[PDB]
């Protein structure tokens, strides 16, 4: 159970950001969802380090 920050970039180079506290094992899936929903590239950081990335643009 950790705090995660998600960072996303839309096709147009706009940006979005989220902070959530959630169980670690869901992070990738979560990351996957953000990208799939928004057609975005999302990176997920825990403790300032990048644990996952997905791209759906």
């Amino acid at each position: 159970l950790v705090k995660v920050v998600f960072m996303g970039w839309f096709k147009n180079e706009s940006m979005f950001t989220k902070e959530i506290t959630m169980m670690k094992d869901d992070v990738q899936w979560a990351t996957t969802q953000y990208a799939e929903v928004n057609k975005a590239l999302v990176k997920a950081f825990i403790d300032d380090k990048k644990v996952c990335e997905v791209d759906c643009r």
Binding site: F16, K18, I20, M22, Q28, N38, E53, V54
Partner: protein
């Protein structure tokens, strides 16, 4: 589309080779030349379509297409051990839990569906039900939804998988099409699906898709720190089990 996933720990061999079989059905894996060398092995994971992937080293994948992505994920759920979590929480929390308790809660939740659904699903649902056990109030409950959503998602496959057994192993959207109320099966599949099965599928999909959409849609230009309320989460967890339990009964 591309992705990278970096997994700390993992396999210690057992999981990795363990992991590979499943991917066995059906993708092609082959060793590849390892250059700069903190990495024991490098592999290429392949498909008829034209997928690619990587390794390895405490392991990393980078890949052309999402599809291997899913498989790797399902497995990790597979690793998933219920007993296993329990120690962690208390250590996380004062609270002490008889794991065997939950099933009571869980069984209670899916009275007619308990033994008719894949274990993988249960595990996710059981995870979501942790919330009922813990008295401490909390900042965010979203995680609980996430489990819920995951379960339902799996549930859809389980049906899909049985009803149409496809080599392709595609995605949920693929089967579904958009109508202003409940979603509907794509015309292409209506021949095969075309049921009360369909209704169950659509009832479920529709719940998943919007909640997924509600939770993960982001406004551009924003830096959300919002949190999901408890009731807010309960409605969801509870609602899902009903669909799942209800679906099984309705589809005897």
């Amino acid at each position: 589309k591309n992705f990278e996933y970096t997994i700390p720990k993992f396999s210690d061999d057992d999981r990795a080779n363990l992991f590979e079989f499943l991917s066995e059905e059906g993708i092609t894996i082959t060793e590849d030349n390892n250059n700069d060398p903190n990495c024991k092995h490098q592999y290429i994971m392949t498909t008829s379509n034209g997928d690619r992937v990587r390794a390895k080293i405490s392991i990393q994948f980078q890949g052309k297409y999402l599809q291997i992505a899913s498989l790797i994920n399902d497995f990790m759920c597979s690793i998933l051990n219920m007993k296993e979590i329990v120690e962690q929480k208390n250590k996380e929390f004062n609270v002490d839990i008889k794991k065997e308790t939950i099933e009571s809660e869980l069984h209670s939740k899916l009275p007619k569906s308990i033994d008719k659904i894949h274990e993988d699903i249960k595990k996710q649902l059981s995870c979501s039900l942790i919330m009922k056990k813990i008295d401490v109030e909390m900042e965010d409950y979203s995680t609980y939804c996430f489990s819920a959503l995951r379960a339902i998602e799996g549930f859809i496959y389980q049906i899909l998988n049985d009803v149409c057994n496809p080599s392709s192993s595609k995605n949920l959207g693929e089967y579904f099409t958009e109508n202003k109320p409940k979603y509907i099966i794509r015309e292409i599949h209506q021949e095969t699906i075309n049921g009360e099965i369909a209704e169950v599928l659509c009832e479920c999909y529709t719940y998943w898709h919007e909640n997924r959409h509600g939770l993960f849609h982001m406004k551009p230009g924003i830096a959300d720190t919002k949190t999901i309320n408890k009731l807010e989460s309960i409605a969801i967890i509870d609602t899902v089990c009903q669909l799942i339990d209800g679906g099984v009964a309705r589809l005897k």
